Amino acid sequence: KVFERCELARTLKRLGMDGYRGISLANWMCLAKWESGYNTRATNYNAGDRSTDYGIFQINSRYWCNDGKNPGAVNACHLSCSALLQDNIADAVACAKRVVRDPQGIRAWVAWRNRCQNRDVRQYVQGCGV
Ligand SMILES: [Cl-]
16 A cells, blocks of 8 residues: 555554654654655565565565565564555554664664665655644
């Protein structure tokens, strides 16, 4: 499913992401924008290591979910990757909290460093009143 920006922002809002481990709603949104366009079914094959990034937050399969492919990957969020392609985004988000529980936090996403760090993020929340 494709969210309207502010729908997402408020849903994340409702699910406890604002300020979770220090990350504001706005950061999460910028992240979401560059990684998925607010689309739960977004995929990406990483030709580099054959991994595959899933859903609205483009969680990677090598370490965060299980998709059956690489027999040496880990699934730290203990969910099938497919549960990251659905309309309800609680799993995504939970898994998203777990990744930002790593010490690097949201800087684990490359797109967050290139697109949001030390840049304008309010924009992604402007008018959502969250
Ligand atoms: Cl993988």
